[PDB]
Amino acid sequence: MENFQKVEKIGEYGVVYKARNKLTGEVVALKKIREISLLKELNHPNIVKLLDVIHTENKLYLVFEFLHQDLKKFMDASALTGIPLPLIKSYLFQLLQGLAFCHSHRVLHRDLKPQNLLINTEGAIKLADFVTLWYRAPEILLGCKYYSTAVDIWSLGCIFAEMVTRRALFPGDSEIDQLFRIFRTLGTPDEVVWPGVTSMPDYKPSFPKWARQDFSKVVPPLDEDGRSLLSQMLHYDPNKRISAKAALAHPFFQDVTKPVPHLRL
Numbered sequence: 001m002e003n004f005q006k007v008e009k010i011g012e013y014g015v016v017y018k019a020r021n022k023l024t025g026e027v028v029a030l031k032k033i034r035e036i037s038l039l040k041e042l043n044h045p046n047i048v049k050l051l052d053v054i055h056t057e058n059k060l061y062l063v064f065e066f067l068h069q070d071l072k073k074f075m076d077a078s079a080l081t082g083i084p085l086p087l088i089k090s091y092l093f094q095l096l097q098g099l100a101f102c103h104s105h106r107v108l109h110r111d112l113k114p115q116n117l118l119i120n121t122e123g124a125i126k127l128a129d130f131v132t133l134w135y136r137a138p139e140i141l142l143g144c145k146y147y148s149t150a151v152d153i154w155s156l157g158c159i160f161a162e163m164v165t166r167r168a169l170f171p172g173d174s175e176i177d178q179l180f181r182i183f184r185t186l187g188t189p190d191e192v193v194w195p196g197v198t199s200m201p202d203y204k205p206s207f208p209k210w211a212r213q214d215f216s217k218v219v220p221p222l223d224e225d226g227r228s229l230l231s232q233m234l235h236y237d238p239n240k241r242i243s244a245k246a247a248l249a250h251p252f253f254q255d256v257t258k259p260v261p262h263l264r265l
């Protein structure tokens with residue numbers, strides 16, 4: 001720990017500081033807390049690099065490359081005009097690349113949210129930090145303990161909708177409020193759309209029965225290609241929900257580019 005000069009707390013199972021490495025001179029993010037040593041080899045341009053793992057005097061320190069901004073603050077700074085569609089598309093495409101990589105190594109994020117998506121001046125966006133319920137998949141809320149990579153696609157679909165509309169898609173303040181906000185928009189799931197749903201641990205026959213709404217009302221002014229991709233990322237059935245690899249081939253990305261964002265640091 002003495003090899004690092006903490007400069008400021010930057011938030012957060014632990015606490016994260018911006019710090020300087022007294023040996024290399026590098027400015028890093030230092031998180032104070034075999035599976036971790038395994039994550040050190042999971043390297044990709046859209047995953048925040050874990051530089052070092054320091055296991056000294058019981059506690060564990062994780063040293064990551066430092067990124068200057070997060071998506072939540074960027075969306076808050078862009079709320080008057082909105083993030084330009086080409087930049088939304090670039091960020092979505094990059095996060096799907098990051099997830100396709102994670103998912104092929106049987107690694108799940110499980111808690112994607114704007115606060116843990118980090119951005120730089122070069123147009124890159126990165127997955128980090130592998131309670132806010134807004135981005136939680138319905139199978140998690142219904143008590144599935146052995147959920148899949150599809151939970152990350154759901155969270156990314158919710159984030160996609162929020163970048164487009166400048167409002168949270170499902171802003172619940174309790175597990176049942178979160179579940180009922182999803183049901184009110186997408187319709188109360190049944191055996192037709194989601195086989196096996198009625199046998200989920202926390203499913204109740206007594207849940208109210210709401211009808212589905214059209215996506216044209218849910219994400220205006222998203223074009224037909226975007227709405228089609230979003231609908232596939234928000235399928236109730238995790239086995240029907242689009243994979244990160246298949247989403248990368250969706251027509252919505254035919255004209256994808258890598259714009260540079262306006263970042264005031």
Ligand SMILES: CC(C)(C)c1cnc(CSc2cnc(NC(=O)C3CCNCC3)s2)o1
Nearest residue numbers: 010012016029064066067069070116128129
């Ligand atoms: C929960 C959260 C803090 C996101 C976290 C846990 N583990 C990691 C990866 S370390 C990291 C790298 N660069 C980071 N930059 C920042 O937090 C920025 C600092 C200036 N304000 C905007 C955010 S944090 O991040």
